[PDB]
Design a protein around this motif. Structure first.
Motif, PDB file in Angstrom:
ATOM      1  N   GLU A  12     -51.886  20.606 -39.138  1.00  0.00           N
ATOM      2  CA  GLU A  12     -51.596  19.453 -38.245  1.00  0.00           C
ATOM      3  C   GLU A  12     -50.129  19.448 -37.839  1.00  0.00           C
ATOM      4  N   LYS A  13     -49.232  19.632 -38.815  1.00  0.00           N
ATOM      5  CA  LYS A  13     -47.760  19.499 -38.655  1.00  0.00           C
ATOM      6  C   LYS A  13     -47.272  20.498 -37.601  1.00  0.00           C
ATOM      7  N   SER A  14     -47.977  21.629 -37.448  1.00  0.00           N
ATOM      8  CA  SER A  14     -47.548  22.762 -36.604  1.00  0.00           C
ATOM      9  C   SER A  14     -48.130  22.643 -35.184  1.00  0.00           C
ATOM     10  N   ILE A  15     -48.870  21.577 -34.876  1.00  0.00           N
ATOM     11  CA  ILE A  15     -49.537  21.432 -33.549  1.00  0.00           C
ATOM     12  C   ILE A  15     -48.666  20.520 -32.695  1.00  0.00           C
ATOM     13  N   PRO A  16     -48.338  20.892 -31.447  1.00  0.00           N
ATOM     14  CA  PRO A  16     -47.559  20.005 -30.589  1.00  0.00           C
ATOM     15  C   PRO A  16     -48.149  18.589 -30.558  1.00  0.00           C
ATOM     16  N   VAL A  17     -47.301  17.551 -30.605  1.00  0.00           N
ATOM     17  CA  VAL A  17     -47.746  16.133 -30.726  1.00  0.00           C
ATOM     18  C   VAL A  17     -48.600  15.734 -29.503  1.00  0.00           C
ATOM     19  N   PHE A  18     -48.349  16.322 -28.332  1.00  0.00           N
ATOM     20  CA  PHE A  18     -49.004  15.994 -27.038  1.00  0.00           C
ATOM     21  C   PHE A  18     -50.311  16.787 -26.841  1.00  0.00           C
ATOM     22  N   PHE A  19     -50.737  17.588 -27.830  1.00  0.00           N
ATOM     23  CA  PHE A  19     -51.864  18.532 -27.664  1.00  0.00           C
ATOM     24  C   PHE A  19     -53.126  17.738 -27.288  1.00  0.00           C
ATOM     25  N   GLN A  20     -53.444  16.692 -28.037  1.00  0.00           N
ATOM     26  CA  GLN A  20     -54.672  15.882 -27.812  1.00  0.00           C
ATOM     27  C   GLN A  20     -54.587  15.173 -26.452  1.00  0.00           C
ATOM     28  N   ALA A  21     -53.427  14.617 -26.101  1.00  0.00           N
ATOM     29  CA  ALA A  21     -53.203  13.976 -24.780  1.00  0.00           C
ATOM     30  C   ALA A  21     -53.421  15.008 -23.671  1.00  0.00           C
ATOM     31  N   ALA A  22     -52.872  16.204 -23.798  1.00  0.00           N
ATOM     32  CA  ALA A  22     -53.041  17.265 -22.779  1.00  0.00           C
ATOM     33  C   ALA A  22     -54.508  17.704 -22.694  1.00  0.00           C
ATOM     34  N   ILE A  85     -54.824  29.140 -27.460  1.00  0.00           N
ATOM     35  CA  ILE A  85     -53.954  30.343 -27.570  1.00  0.00           C
ATOM     36  C   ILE A  85     -52.501  29.907 -27.491  1.00  0.00           C
ATOM     37  N   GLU A  86     -52.180  29.129 -26.465  1.00  0.00           N
ATOM     38  CA  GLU A  86     -50.795  28.699 -26.197  1.00  0.00           C
ATOM     39  C   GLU A  86     -50.322  27.717 -27.272  1.00  0.00           C
ATOM     40  N   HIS A  87     -51.128  26.726 -27.644  1.00  0.00           N
ATOM     41  CA  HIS A  87     -50.634  25.575 -28.448  1.00  0.00           C
ATOM     42  C   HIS A  87     -50.956  25.758 -29.931  1.00  0.00           C
ATOM     43  N   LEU A  88     -52.009  26.482 -30.301  1.00  0.00           N
ATOM     44  CA  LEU A  88     -52.400  26.653 -31.729  1.00  0.00           C
ATOM     45  C   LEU A  88     -52.063  28.077 -32.206  1.00  0.00           C
ATOM     46  N   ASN A  89     -51.714  28.984 -31.284  1.00  0.00           N
ATOM     47  CA  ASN A  89     -51.384  30.390 -31.617  1.00  0.00           C
ATOM     48  C   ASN A  89     -52.631  31.003 -32.266  1.00  0.00           C
ATOM     49  N   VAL A  90     -53.794  30.725 -31.684  1.00  0.00           N
ATOM     50  CA  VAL A  90     -55.107  31.266 -32.112  1.00  0.00           C
ATOM     51  C   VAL A  90     -55.531  32.287 -31.060  1.00  0.00           C
TER      52      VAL A  90
END
Ligand SMILES: [Cl-]
Lengths: 138, 140, 141
Positions: A12-22, A85-90
Motif C-alpha cells: 500500500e505504502k508504495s502505491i501513488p496516493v492518487f492511484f484510486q482517483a486516477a 505497469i506505470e503505477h504498481l511496477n507490475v
C-alpha cells in the motif's frame, strides 16, 4: 457496480496516493457511468501469489451493468494494464483482469434495482441519438 | 483465472508456509492450466464467521475458463477440502467452495483475451486425441 | 453460499460487535436457508472509495443457490441497506449490493454438491404446497 477491485501483493505504502482517483476517472470515462457509483477497492499488500511466485502481480475485477463486450473488455484491459505497469511496477505478464456482467435486477443502488435497458447500453444509445438530433435538429 | 481465493478466519501464523505453493501445484494439475497464470489469494485472519459462530471455517472460490462441470467440481471440492482439513485444521462441515465459470472474452492476460475454445475444454480434448494417436501407432 | 460479503471503508473499531450476527440472523430468515451455512465476511477498514470520495460507503455481495429474483433482491437490498445505515452510519446513496446466483452443482458444502432443485426454489415451493395441503385437509395415503 461499477466496482473495480485490484488484488495486488504490491505494498500500500508504495502505491501513488492518487492511484484510486486516477483509476476512478479512467474507468468512469471507459464505462460511461456516473462517477458517483464508481467504486475502486484496492486490496494492496494482499497475500496473493501467481505461478507459485511472489513477484509483483495483479488480479483485478470489473463488475458493471452493461458496457462489457469482447471489444470494450480488451480496450479497458490494456488501459488498466498500462496503469498497473506505470503505477504498481507490475509486468503485463503478471496481470489478469476479469470482466463481470451484472444483471440490472440483481444489483441495488440507493433503495432500488437498476433499469434492464442499461444491460444492452440503451441508456447510452438513446441519449447518443437524442444528442445527435439536438446538434443536427432532424 | 485460474484464481483460487481462500477466505478463512484461520490465523496467517498458523498456516504452513508452503500452503499456497501446494494449493497452486494441486489446482494446476486439477484444472490442467499453465502454472504461470495460477493465482492463489489467501485471505487468512479474515473477519469471516459461519452459522453466526467463529469456529474455523473456509469460503473458497475457483475462477477458471473451461474445466468446471458437476463431475470435476465435486472431485476438486473434496481434494480442496482435504488440503484445508490437513493444512488449516478446518472441519469438512465448515467448508464451502464456489466454482466460477469465466468467459474467455471476459478475461484478459498479458494484453489479450483468451481463446473461446478453452471454455468447452477443446484444448484438452484435441490434445487427448493427438496423444492417444501418438501412443497407439497412428502418426498419419 | 449463502455468503454475505461486506466491503466498507468504515473502520472495524467503529462497527457494533453483533453486526455480523445480526446480518446472519436477518439473511437466514430472508433467504430461507439453514443458519449453519450462512457466512458473513466483513472487510472493514477496506481501502474502498466511491465517486473518488472516501466518505463511508458499502459494496456488498449476496452469493446464494436459488432465492434470488427481482422481487426478493429489492426487498433484501432495502433491509440490508437499513442495517448498514444503522450499524455503519453510511447513507443509502453510498450502498451498492450485488446478488449473485450460484449453481447447485458449482458449489460444495461438507464433501458434496447441492441438490439442483434448490436453484429453482423447489425445496421451498414443494414444502409450501405440502404444508398448504396439510392445513386444508388433503391426504396422501
Ligand atoms: Cl462472480
Amino acid at each position: 457496480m461499477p466496482v473495480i477491485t485490484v488484488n495486488t501483493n504490491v505494498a500500500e505504502k508504495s502505491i501513488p496516493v492518487f492511484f484510486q482517483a486516477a483509476l476512478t476517472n479512467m474507468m468512469t470515462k471507459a464505462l460511461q457511468k456516473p462517477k458517483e457509483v464508481m467504486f475502486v477497492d484496492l486490496r494492496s499488500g494482499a497475500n496473493i501469489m501467481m505461478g507459485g511466485d511472489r513477484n509483483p502481480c495483479v488480479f483485478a475485477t470489473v463488475e458493471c451493468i452493461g458496457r462489457l463486450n469482447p471489444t470494450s473488455n480488451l480496450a479497458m484491459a490494456r488501459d488498466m494494464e498500462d496503469m498497473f505497469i506505470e503505477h504498481l511496477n507490475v509486468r503485463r505478464e503478471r496481470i489478469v483482469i476479469r470482466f463481470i456482467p451484472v444483471p440490472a435486477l440483481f444489483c441495488s443502488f440507493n433503495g432500488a434495482l437498476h433499469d434492464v435497458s442499461i444491460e444492452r447500453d440503451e441508456d447510452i444509445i438513446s441519449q447518443a441519438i437524442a444528442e445527435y438530433l439536438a446538434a443536427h435538429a432532424a
